[PDB]
Amino acid sequence: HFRIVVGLGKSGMSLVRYLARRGLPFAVVDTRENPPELATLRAQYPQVEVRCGELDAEFLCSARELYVSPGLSLRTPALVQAAAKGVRISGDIDLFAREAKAPIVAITGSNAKSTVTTLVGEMAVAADKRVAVGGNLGTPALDLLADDIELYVLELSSFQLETCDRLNAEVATVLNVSEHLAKHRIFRGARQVVVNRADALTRPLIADTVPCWSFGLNKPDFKAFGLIEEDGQKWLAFQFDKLLPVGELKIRGAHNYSNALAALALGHAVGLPFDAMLGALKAFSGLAHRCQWVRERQGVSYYDDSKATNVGAALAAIEGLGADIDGKLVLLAGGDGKGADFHDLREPVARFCRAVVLLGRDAGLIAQALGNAVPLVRVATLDEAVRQAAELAREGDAVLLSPACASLDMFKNFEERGRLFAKAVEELA
């Protein structure tokens, strides 16, 4: 107990692995009497001291560092007592930041984190880098640590950044902010930043004193990635250099063009050559249920954006795909809204939608927020939502599942909702 892992779960087990494989002395504690991972720990690491129940503050103060699971309150009185006593309140990313021996690309934001992370990951692979990609919900960062790595690409949550004293990223970004200081801990020690010209809350104080690259959907200036319009066609661009027509991407929607430009900026900051980045961009087809094409039927396209589980995400996808088609959107939305203010959807819906089909627990709340902006239809099931959306759509339109809500009121998770949407779409005559 020179070091104590505080809290089991995904990251805690990666700390157990890391500390043990490095031979370091450590113990494990958890507040629950029978945490789910207790059996796995007791079986895979029988030699590790494990204490379950009310945290022994005296035991926690016998360590120099506590590695606190991200989704565990730092307000726990024993942690407060340990923190009041001088113990380092740490975590997996804090330890990773101090152990890493290669530059880190560090990505957070309210939305688009996994899209941009995986794209930078594919750029790095295409550039022949010995790259390691992880963080947040993916591969635990500590499982990536090795001397042969040339580049780390880390997606980070605010919770992981809370106990990280100085990440010292080579380049860091907050992609966007929607309902910020926790996110901005990603900039502590950052040697470069990438900012979103469309979101003022992404610009850190250090953007005045370290290299600052930007992305956005308007025409870029120096040190900026953006869109150039020429010959009626839109191009991804760096400064005055057209890179690629957006039509050669396999991902759709202006929000995904923004994600591509963010990834280009991140890869550029760490020296990835443009030919490698552009090759990966042409090959990148996006992640499952991130505005994914399902079908083209009678001139109408169908897109599964089931992972738009919050209002900021749906707004971006509505505006994004709405600006990327020949017609109007027929939007499918609703589900468990988690108390969100849906008013921000009214203007994008009025601007881009022919109609909205609403289902799920909070369809009524969404209807209240949308008012009479566009024609609304209420349905009971996803199958009926798709059938009605197809009848409402006209040639050139896109039918978009971008629900702005969690799915747990009717589905196991957003993946199941997306799959059942695609199934219904594929069963249309």
Q: Which residue has the tokens 């580049």?
A: 151
Asked if 111 is part of the footprint of ligand ADP (rule: CB under 6 A), the reply reads yes
**Is-contact 274 140, C-beta < 8 A?**
no
- 184 catalytically annotated: no
Cβ neighbour number for residue 288 with a 10 Å cutoff = 13
DSSP string covering 157-195, please?
-HHHHHT-S----SEEEE------TTGGGGGTT-S-EEE
Asked if 305 is part of the footprint of ligand ADP (rule: CB under 6 A), the reply reads yes
How many CA atoms, within 13 angstroms, populate the side-chain half-sphere of residue 429? Answer: 3
Catalytic residue among 180, 338, 343, 412: 180
Catalytic residue among 1, 85, 101, 136: 136
- Within positions 386 to 415, which residues make up the interface with ligand ADP, using CB under 6 A? 402
Q: Is 290 annotated as a binding residue?
A: yes
Among residues 163 and 259, whose Cβ is nearest to ligand ADP? 259
Which of these segments, 33-41, 106-114, 225-233, 244-252, binds ligand ADP (CB under 6 A)?
A: 106-114
Strand partners, 106: 154, 172
Cβ neighbour number for residue 328 with a 10 Å cutoff = 19
- Within positions 247 to 286, which residues make up the interface with ligand ADP, using CB under 6 A? 255, 258-259
- 180 catalytically annotated: yes
Q: Is 354 annotated as a binding residue?
A: no
Among residues 13 and 260, whose Cβ is nearest to ligand ADP? 260
Amino acid in the structure at residue 285: S
Which of 290, 328, 354, 387 touches ligand ADP by CB under 6 A?
Answer: 290
Cβ neighbour number for residue 230 with a 10 Å cutoff = 10
DSSP E strand boundaries for 101-250: 104-108, 131-134, 151-155, 171-174, 193-196, 212-215, 224-230, 233-238, 241-245
Tell me the Ramachandran region of residue 360: left when phi exceeds 0, alpha when psi lies from -120 to 50, beta otherwise. Answer: left
Asked if 307 is part of the footprint of ligand ADP (rule: CB under 6 A), the reply reads yes
Question: By rule CB under 6 A, what string of x and - marks binding of each residue 315-354 to ligand ADP?
Answer: -xx-------------------------------------
Q: Is 114 annotated as a binding residue?
A: yes
Among residues 28 and 217, whose Cβ is nearest to ligand ADP? 217
Q: Which residue has the tokens 């309902």?
A: 179
Q: Is 307 annotated as a binding residue?
A: yes
Which of these segments, 94-102, 125-133, 160-168, 303-311, binds ligand ADP (CB under 6 A)?
A: 303-311
Which of 176, 192, 214, 388 touches ligand ADP by CB under 6 A?
Answer: 176
- Within positions 115 to 134, which residues make up the interface with ligand ADP, using CB under 6 A? 115
Distance of CA 34 to the CA centre of its chain: 31
Residue (of 391, 400, 394) closest to 429 by Cα position: 391
Among residues 41 and 119, whose Cβ is nearest to ligand ADP? 119
| Minimum distance, C-beta of residue 172 to ligand ADP, in the bound complex (Å) | 15
Catalytic residue among 1, 34, 101, 113: 113
Count of residues binding ligand ADP (CB under 6 A)?
A: 20
> b/e map of 289-317 (b: 16 or more CB within 10 Å)?
bbbbbbeeeeebbbbbbbbbbbbbbbbbb
Residue (of 27, 13, 34) closest to 66 by Cα position: 27
Q: Is 157 annotated as a binding residue?
A: no
Asked if 173 is part of the footprint of ligand ADP (rule: CB under 6 A), the reply reads no
φ/ψ of residue 337, rounded to 5: -80, -10
Which of these segments, 92-100, 181-189, 308-316, 326-334, binds ligand ADP (CB under 6 A)?
A: 308-316
Asked if 114 is part of the footprint of ligand ADP (rule: CB under 6 A), the reply reads yes
Asked if 160 is part of the footprint of ligand ADP (rule: CB under 6 A), the reply reads no
Rounded Cα–Cα distance for residues 34 and 53 (Å): 8
| Minimum distance, C-beta of residue 266 to ligand ADP, in the bound complex (Å) | 14
- 136 catalytically annotated: yes
> b/e map of 364-395 (b: 16 or more CB within 10 Å)?
ebbbebbeebbebbbbeebeebbbbbbebbee
Q: Detail the residues annotated as belonging to a binding site for UDP-N-acetyl-alpha-D-muramoyl-L-alanine.
A: 10-11, 31-32, 71, 136
Q: Detail the residues annotated as belonging to a binding site.
A: 10-11, 31-32, 71, 109-115, 136, 259, 290, 305, 307
Residues marked active site are found at 113, 136, 180
Which chain residues interact with ligand ADP by CB under 6 A?
A: 111-115, 176, 255, 258-259, 287, 290-291, 305, 307-308, 312-313, 316-317, 402
